[PDB]
Amino acid sequence: NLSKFCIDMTAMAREGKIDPVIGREEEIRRVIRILSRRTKNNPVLIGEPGVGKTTIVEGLAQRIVNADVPDNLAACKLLSLDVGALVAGSKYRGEFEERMKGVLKEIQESKETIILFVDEIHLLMGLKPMLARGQLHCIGATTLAEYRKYIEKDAAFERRFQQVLVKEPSITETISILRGLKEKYEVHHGVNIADAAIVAAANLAARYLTSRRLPDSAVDLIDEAAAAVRVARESQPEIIDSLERRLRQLKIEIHALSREKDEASKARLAQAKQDAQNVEEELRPLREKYERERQRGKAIQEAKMKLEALRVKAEDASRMGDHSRAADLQYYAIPEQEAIIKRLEAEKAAADSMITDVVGPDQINEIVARWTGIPVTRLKTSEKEKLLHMEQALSKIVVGQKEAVQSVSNAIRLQRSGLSNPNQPPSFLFCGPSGTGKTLLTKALAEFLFDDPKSMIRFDMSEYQERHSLSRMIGAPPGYVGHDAGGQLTEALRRRPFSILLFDEVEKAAKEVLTVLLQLMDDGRITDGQGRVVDAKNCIVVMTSNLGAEYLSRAIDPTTRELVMNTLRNYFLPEFLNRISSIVIFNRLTRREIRKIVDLRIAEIQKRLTDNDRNVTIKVSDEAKDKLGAQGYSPVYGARPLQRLLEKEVLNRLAILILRGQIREGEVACVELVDGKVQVLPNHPD
Amino acid sequence: VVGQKEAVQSVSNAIRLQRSGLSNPNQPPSFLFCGPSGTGKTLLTKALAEFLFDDPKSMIRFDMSEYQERHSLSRMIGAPPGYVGHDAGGQLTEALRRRPFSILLFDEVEKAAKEVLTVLLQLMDDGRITDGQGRVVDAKNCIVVMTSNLGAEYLSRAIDPTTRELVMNTLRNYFLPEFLNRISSIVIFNRLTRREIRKIVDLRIAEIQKRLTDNDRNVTIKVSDEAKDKLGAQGYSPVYGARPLQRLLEKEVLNRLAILILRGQIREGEVACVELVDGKVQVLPNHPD
Numbered sequence A: 001n002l003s004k005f006c007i008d009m010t011a012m013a014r015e016g017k018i019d020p021v022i023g024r025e026e027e028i029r030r031v032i033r034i035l036s037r038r039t040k041n042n043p044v045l046i047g048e049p050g051v052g053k054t055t056i057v058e059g060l061a062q063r064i065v066n067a068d069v070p071d072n073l074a075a076c077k078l079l080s081l082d083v084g085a086l087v088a089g090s091k092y093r094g095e096f097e098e099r100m101k102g103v104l105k106e107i108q109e110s111k112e113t114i115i116l117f118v119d120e121i122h123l124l125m126g127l128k129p130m131l132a133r134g135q136l137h138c139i140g141a142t143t144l145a146e147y148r149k150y151i152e153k154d155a156a157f158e159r160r161f162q163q164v165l166v167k168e169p170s171i172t173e174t175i176s177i178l179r180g181l182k183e184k185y186e187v188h189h190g191v192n193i194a195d196a197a198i199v200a201a202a203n204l205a206a207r208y209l210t211s212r213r214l215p216d217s218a219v220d221l222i223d224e225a226a227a228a229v230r231v232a233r234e235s236q237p238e239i240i241d242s243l244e245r246r247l248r249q250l251k252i253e254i255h256a257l258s259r260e261k262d263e264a265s266k267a268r269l270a271q272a273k274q275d276a277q278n279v280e281e282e283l284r285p286l287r288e289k290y291e292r293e294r295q296r297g298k299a300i301q302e303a304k305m306k307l308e309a310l311r312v313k314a315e316d317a318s319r320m321g322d323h324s325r326a327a328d329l330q331y332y333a334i335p336e337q338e339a340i341i342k343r344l345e346a347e348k349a350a351a352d353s354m355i356t357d358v359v360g361p362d363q364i365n366e367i368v369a370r371w372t373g374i375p376v377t378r379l380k381t382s383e384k385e386k387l388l389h390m391e392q393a394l395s396k397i398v399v400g401q402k403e404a405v406q407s408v409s410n411a412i413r414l415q416r417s418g419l420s421n422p423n424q425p426p427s428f429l430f431c432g433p434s435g436t437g438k439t440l441l442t443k444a445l446a447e448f449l450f451d452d453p454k455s456m457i458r459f460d461m462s463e464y465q466e467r468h469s470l471s472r473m474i475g476a477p478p479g480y481v482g483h484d485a486g487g488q489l490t491e492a493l494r495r496r497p498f499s500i501l502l503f504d505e506v507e508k509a510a511k512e513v514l515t516v517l518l519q520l521m522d523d524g525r526i527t528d529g530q531g532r533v534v535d536a537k538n539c540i541v542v543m544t545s546n547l548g549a550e551y552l553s554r555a556i557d558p559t560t561r562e563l564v565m566n567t568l569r570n571y572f573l574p575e576f577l578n579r580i581s582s583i584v585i586f587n588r589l590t591r592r593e594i595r596k597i598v599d600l601r602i603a604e605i606q607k608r609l610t611d612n613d614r615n616v617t618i619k620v621s622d623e624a625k626d627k628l629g630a631q632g633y634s635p636v637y638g639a640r641p642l643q644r645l646l647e648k649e650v651l652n653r654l655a656i657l658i659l660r661g662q663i664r665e666g667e668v669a670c671v672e673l674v675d676g677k678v679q680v681l682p683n684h685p686d
Numbered sequence B: 001v002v003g004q005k006e007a008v009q010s011v012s013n014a015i016r017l018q019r020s021g022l023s024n025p026n027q028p029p030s031f032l033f034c035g036p037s038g039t040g041k042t043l044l045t046k047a048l049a050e051f052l053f054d055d056p057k058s059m060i061r062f063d064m065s066e067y068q069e070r071h072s073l074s075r076m077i078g079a080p081p082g083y084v085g086h087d088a089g090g091q092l093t094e095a096l097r098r099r100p101f102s103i104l105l106f107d108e109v110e111k112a113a114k115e116v117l118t119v120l121l122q123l124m125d126d127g128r129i130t131d132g133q134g135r136v137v138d139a140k141n142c143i144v145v146m147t148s149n150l151g152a153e154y155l156s157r158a159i160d161p162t163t164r165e166l167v168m169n170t171l172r173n174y175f176l177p178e179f180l181n182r183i184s185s186i187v188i189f190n191r192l193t194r195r196e197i198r199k200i201v202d203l204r205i206a207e208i209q210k211r212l213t214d215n216d217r218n219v220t221i222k223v224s225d226e227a228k229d230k231l232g233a234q235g236y237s238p239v240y241g242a243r244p245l246q247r248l249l250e251k252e253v254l255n256r257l258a259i260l261i262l263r264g265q266i267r268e269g270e271v272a273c274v275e276l277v278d279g280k281v282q283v284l285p286n287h288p289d
């Protein structure tokens, strides 16, 4: 029998082997409704990895055994085909075909009405279960991209399925899932889980673990924290460790001192016995309280496990009409058990760091820090603290755009405090000359909000200038130009919801593409090429332009404000400009502002020198710093030429002199203005 | 929409005339909104969209500032094969095919090229238009709203009936009499009074109050009378009407109200009192830092 490749999900439901399903009621109704059709009655779940496609099928198994299904599905055996163990457990040989025909024909013959679930069904499309006589009912699962690239390219097979879009849960929806799962993961690892950790896991998974989708990214995070405390609780506390070792040390010293015959040894041998006794007097109360209390936390955890097992037997008794055994458990066994837990737990808090058996926000922040590589100190700081000094944090990166930094900071504060439309993402149009900070501010925002430059995604509107390019942005219907690649924007929103979308040189976008941005800015959601609406409530929109550099001379001025804004009113329609949260204007950088930018860059070069072994300190004379700022600025490219200019004039020679030994450890690399050209001079002749 | 009772009654009566079957079934309801900027012309059209179709997307906006020259007509209806914008089609004709039950808003209609106006008259008179390739597209089930401000000169803050034909004679030279005659209702917006401007302020804090309630926060915004007065005085403009009001509240009240909330100086269950201190609107903390 080819039960080697399938697991009975309906069986697992009767045995309490399926963790609870939270929410997702409308999706399970859709699956039931599709299955009950006679038309195309095979649902295919379409969603990103980890959004909960499988647990939807698991909920259906729970509904089949609980009679919460229509009659046509009540006596169904819902089987899950292990396609992973099928294609990987096989080679090019004819065993893939032979193995699947075997299972497909065991389904054929036996007389249970059987619904086959195949997760990652695209792996079966590179095979032919055309048993659509009404022999088998199938539930498929895959991602949207793989549905497009592998399932959508065999229409005849596809048309017998009906899409069910499974969107990613909100953070709020995610904690409801984690809260509902809380007790299962408590009893499983034998530890306790605080609610603030659950809120921490959901909020942090969405913000920093952008590589995996909710709620899986939050589930994996709590599960790893719990496993990290499963070993902490089975280890002696730190103070019992330290005490026990000094005690063993003093016992060594006592045996040794008792051998030496002299006046000073005997006076401290007696002191060593006392020090040993003092340690033992501090250690015995503690070591006793620890074991006393780890033995009870373990007695509680099995008390919880027999309770759960009783409820499985009780649910199955009442399901099978055995009222005799169902009365045993529901009225006597289970409340006798529940009374044992109530008493053992009540004394637990009453007994009363030590015995770490709790998943707290610290354990979540530490687990994430190891995975994400961000220092734990940066994850403990409250969002409210950062946002209150946001202008401070950005101004360390962006010079001379105080009016811009204030606008970005105020808009973000408006949304975490709940005063902005919750269906509209913050939207920005940066306007001003090249090399003034428009892109840089957006990078600083990315690293401030998500502590990662990757959190921003860049779209260059120079590549979306014609009406033909819209399919590149959102995708295309089947059989069209770029149906399979999808859209750049739509695919970015599905896989990186908490992102900053930078649209560079937005003035060049085709009017059809601008229309998509207005939908993004107004409704917080867009429609892809196939009518599907993808969500975007949790992104940030930054658009950059330079249509105002004509009226900005190096000097911010308020009369110049509407000459650039009237230049904007003809390129963009008034409804476009009205739906932008803040139209922000960058002015040209002054000579002093250009000079601090130079100090910023030497500070970074100074950091790499310090980050490596070298104790070389870069100091810049005033007039040399002045020539760098004069050679660096350009009325056309702003501060862009500055990074390369320093490299060419200062850094090239500074390298050579370091490796030549003409600037040694502990000395200063003095960069001067000699004969009107910036140079850095040696400190020792060759 | 505050302070445009004569306008709301006109829109309401015209719609009632057509669901009850007393208006021409081949003519869509057509409106020309006339009056100063920021008086409610666009807003009333949005409210109509959300009232009739419970969706702001049910309206489609055409800015006549982008149809000022005779060349622009092909943008409106399309072009014969091989011409300028044959493939993009027309904005109006493509909108009517794909969104028949729509509200078509033509903003600043006074600036449309006379050829484009001709298309609107066909839309208003026959309920159908001809695209660039002679094809006739149907439009029996749409609504036409046109906005203008050619009458703001003769409307001081006070609606008055002698002022009615000074704005309507200003309309008679920009638009031909057959154009004006085929419009279901020529509706005039007057300037908003000081009390009307004040309820608009209460409307906007009510929306900010809703988002606060819609999120977790039990912070209640109350506005003193004189602070509410300064907001309405700083907000109104004889040129931009009530447009500066939304940003003014954001700049003076909402920016600080955010900071104080995240600082904990206005906590759950308390009131954000917005006052007039030293002649400038501010919202004060309830607890020192």
Ligand SMILES: Nc1ncnc2c1ncn2[C@@H]1O[C@H](COP(=O)(O)OP(=O)(O)O)[C@@H](O)[C@H]1O
Pocket (backbone or CB within 6 Å): A019, A020, A021, A022, A023, A024, A047, A048, A049, A050, A051, A052, A053, A054, A055, A056, A177, A181, A215, A216, A219
């Ligand atoms: N509605 C839900 N209720 C409880 N747990 C859920 C829910 N949705 C997802 N999960 C959890 O998320 C994790 C991965 O979900 P899963 O259904 O395997 O995602 P997918 O199958 O879409 O890759 C599982 O550990 C599961 O327990």
Ligand SMILES: Nc1ncnc2c1ncn2[C@@H]1O[C@H](COP(=O)(O)OP(=O)(O)O)[C@@H](O)[C@H]1O
Pocket (backbone or CB within 6 Å): A397, A398, A399, A400, A401, A432, A433, A434, A435, A436, A437, A438, A439, A440, A441, A544, A589, A597, A638, A639, A640, A643
């Ligand atoms: N205001 C500024 N503060 C600091 N550096 C700046 C500033 N403006 C420009 N730069 C430098 O110039 C480079 C490019 O600037 P950027 O902001 O990308 O120009 P744009 O305004 O065209 O987006 C950045 O890497 C940065 O080093």
Ligand SMILES: Nc1ncnc2c1ncn2[C@@H]1O[C@H](COP(=O)(O)OP(=O)(O)O)[C@@H](O)[C@H]1O
Pocket (backbone or CB within 6 Å): B001, B002, B003, B004, B035, B036, B037, B038, B039, B040, B041, B042, B043, B044, B147, B192, B200, B241, B242, B243, B246
């Ligand atoms: N009568 C009014 N009632 C309420 N709000 C108004 C009124 N008039 C103007 N506003 C405010 O001003 C903004 C712009 O008004 P709008 O009606 O677009 O001006 P216009 O008359 O130029 O179309 C609206 O978003 C609205 O908040």
